Amino acid sequence: MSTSLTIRLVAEADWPALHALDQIILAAYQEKMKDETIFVAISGQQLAGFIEVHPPTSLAAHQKQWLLSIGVSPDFQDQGIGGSLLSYIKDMAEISGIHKLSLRVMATNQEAIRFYEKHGFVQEAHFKEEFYINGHYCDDYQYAYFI
Amino acid sequence: SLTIRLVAEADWPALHALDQIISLAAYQEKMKDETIFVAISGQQLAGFIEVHPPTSLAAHQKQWLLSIGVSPDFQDQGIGGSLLSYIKDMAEISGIHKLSLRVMATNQEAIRFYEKHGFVQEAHFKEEFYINGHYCDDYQYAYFI
Amino acid sequence: MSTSLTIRLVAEADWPALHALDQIISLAAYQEKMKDETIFVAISGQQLAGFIEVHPPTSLAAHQKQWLLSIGVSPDFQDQGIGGSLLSYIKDMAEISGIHKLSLRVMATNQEAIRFYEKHGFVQEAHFKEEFYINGHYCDDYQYAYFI
Amino acid sequence: LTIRLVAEADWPALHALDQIISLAAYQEKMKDETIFVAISGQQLAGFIEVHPPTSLAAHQKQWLLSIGVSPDFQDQGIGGSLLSYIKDMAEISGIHKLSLRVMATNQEAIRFYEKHGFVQEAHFKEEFYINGHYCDDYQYAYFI
Ligand SMILES: [Mg+2]
Ligand SMILES: [Mg+2]
Numbered sequence: 001m002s003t004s005l006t007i008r009l010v011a012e013a014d015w016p017a018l019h020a021l022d023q024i025i026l027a028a029y030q031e032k033m034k035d036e037t038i039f040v041a042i043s044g045q046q047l048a049g050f051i052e053v054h055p056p057t058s059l060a061a062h063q064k065q066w067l068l069s070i071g072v073s074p075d076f077q078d079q080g081i082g083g084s085l086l087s088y089i090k091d092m093a094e095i096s097g098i099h100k101l102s103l104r105v106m107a108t109n110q111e112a113i114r115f116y117e118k119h120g121f122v123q124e125a126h127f128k129e130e131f132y133i134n135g136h137y138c139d140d141y142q143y144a145y146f147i
Numbered sequence: 148s149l150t151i152r153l154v155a156e157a158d159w160p161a162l163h164a165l166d167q168i169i170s171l172a173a174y175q176e177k178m179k180d181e182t183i184f185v186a187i188s189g190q191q192l193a194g195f196i197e198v199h200p201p202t203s204l205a206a207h208q209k210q211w212l213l214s215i216g217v218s219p220d221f222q223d224q225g226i227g228g229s230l231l232s233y234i235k236d237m238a239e240i241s242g243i244h245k246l247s248l249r250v251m252a253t254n255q256e257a258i259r260f261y262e263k264h265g266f267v268q269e270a271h272f273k274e275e276f277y278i279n280g281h282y283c284d285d286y287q288y289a290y291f292i
Numbered sequence: 293m294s295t296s297l298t299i300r301l302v303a304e305a306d307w308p309a310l311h312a313l314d315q316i317i318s319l320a321a322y323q324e325k326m327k328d329e330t331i332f333v334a335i336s337g338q339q340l341a342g343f344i345e346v347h348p349p350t351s352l353a354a355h356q357k358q359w360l361l362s363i364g365v366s367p368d369f370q371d372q373g374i375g376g377s378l379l380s381y382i383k384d385m386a387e388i389s390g391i392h393k394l395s396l397r398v399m400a401t402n403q404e405a406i407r408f409y410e411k412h413g414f415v416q417e418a419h420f421k422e423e424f425y426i427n428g429h430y431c432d433d434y435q436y437a438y439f440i
Numbered sequence: 441l442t443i444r445l446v447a448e449a450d451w452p453a454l455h456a457l458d459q460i461i462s463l464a465a466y467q468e469k470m471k472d473e474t475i476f477v478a479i480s481g482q483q484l485a486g487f488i489e490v491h492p493p494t495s496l497a498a499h500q501k502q503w504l505l506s507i508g509v510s511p512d513f514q515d516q517g518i519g520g521s522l523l524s525y526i527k528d529m530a531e532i533s534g535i536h537k538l539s540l541r542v543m544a545t546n547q548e549a550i551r552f553y554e555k556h557g558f559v560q561e562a563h564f565k566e567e568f569y570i571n572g573h574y575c576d577d578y579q580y581a582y583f584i
Contacts, residue, residue: 135351205569205570240389392569392574
């Protein structure tokens with residue numbers, strides 16, 4: 001009859017599910033990721049995805065920017081999880097005083113490129129021959145969103 | 148009389164001073180493991196160039212992020228160009244494919260410098276650095292060995 | 293009178309001599325096939341006395357901080373410490389290049405190379421038994437490593 | 441459970457197994473490769489791949505092995521059946537030695553190969569650079 005999708009800050013009970021999801025795409029993780037700001041997408045009563053944010057560097061001059069990372073579960077594909085997370089982060093950023101969101105995406109990653117551009121991100125960088133992968137060099141883009 | 152070679156224990160008190168113009172035991176403990184090549188005119192430290200990969204990523208280890216410092220008393224002597232040309236040769240043997248660095252949109256003379264020596268623009272980061280109420284642009288420049 | 297030994301990166305001029313040497317240990321065939329390669333040369337007087345060649349053991353990114361090494365010394369420049377001087381130079385070069393580890397493989401029967409590498413601080417990391425097939429028989433091989 | 445070489449019909453499920461452990465790029469990538477697949481009732485349970493470790497003539501009596509097993513088909517002894525199969529195949533192909541490399545941290549692969557008679561030949565220290573840290577590797581061998 002109905003479905004519900006909730007996005008909220010990560011809670012203690014989430015970590016078993018998060019640790020599990022991060023493997024698909026124990027307490028060391030739980031320690032590591034409490035230095036980290038994570039928001040969680042809950043579909044019904046299951047973890048469907050997360051968005052994680054942190055300033056791109058430790059520089060004070062960088063503290064008004066969030067580098068972002070999205071993870072969507074293999075069991076919650078194609079239900080707008082990615083977009084709901086982006087929308088929520090843009091709203092959180094506005095109140096947090098964050099001026100700018102960014103991330104990097106591999107040139108060959110057409111789906112991510114289209115996703116972020118669809119969500120109003122613009123290309124700021126084309127890093128050519130940027131990453132060495134098994135004998136070849138791969139290009140990378142940086143995308144930005146202005147709150 | 149220009150000799151470029153790697154850093155020695157003799158260079159550290161002279162290198163600490165050129166750093167101030169852009170604690171003495173704190174700096175030698177921060178710069179200890181670092182790859183630093185030093186420029187010597189006569190028997191004086193004219194400048195330096197520091198290189199490290201941009202990140203710890205394995206996929207990034209064929210790239211050098213570079214840092215150049217030139218002494219106030221050694222301007223116009225082409226110290227920068229000699230340092231840079233030296234690192235391009237070193238890169239070629241170290242297996243380094245790409246050189247990069249970032250420069251503030253306002254540092255017009257660093258931009259000119261890097262353009263003059265064959266670097267091309269790869270990034271224009273808008274409103275990137277927050278400085279006293281204002282946002283400032285950054286550029287990334289790259290050189291392909 | 294006086295004797296000089298210099299080690300430096302290979303130069304276009306060296307290639308005729310390098311070609312002739314590798315035939316013991318043409319113009320473009322050897323020269324381009326080895327143009328991408330990182331080769332250093334030992335020059336004794338102004339003749340080519342030997343070389344050391346280095347590259348990562350594989351193309352994997354995770355392997356890019358290691359050099360697999362090969363040394364060649366001329367039959368006309370035996371027993372004058374060329375091998376050791378090349379080894380010393382490469383270890384210093386690796387330190388500036390950010391290279392963490394040197395390695396190579398040596399046939400179990402090659403007692404002199406074993407002694408040479410062990411003398412130069414390389415430690416055995418592998419004993420590959422019955423590893424190479426050679427005219428009816430299987431031969432063992434070691435891997436040696438040096439930690440910069 | 442049936443073990444046979446790869447067929448021209450196995451590629452949509454075999455590529456699918458790879459992503460967990462492009463279909464046009466992958467079929468092309470594994471065109472001429474020696475692969476045996478484990479089938480549990482018209483279902484792809486696992487696979488084993490073998491090639492000489494190098495192009496050296498002197499290495500041609502050796503197989504480097506790679507094993508993959510489906511997430512659905514764990515604990516079914518699929519791994520062991522593939523190995524046992526390749527041990528018998530090696531015997532007739534004239535292969536003298538089987539080998540592979542295993543990360544020091546992959547305890548469960550090490551136990552697996554040890555259980556099936558492989559012995560350690562190498563311990564490569566600080567061998568793989570991974571995000572700022574260096575990681576050990578082992579080589580394991582089986583003698584036919
Ligand atoms: Mg919105
Ligand atoms: Mg030495």
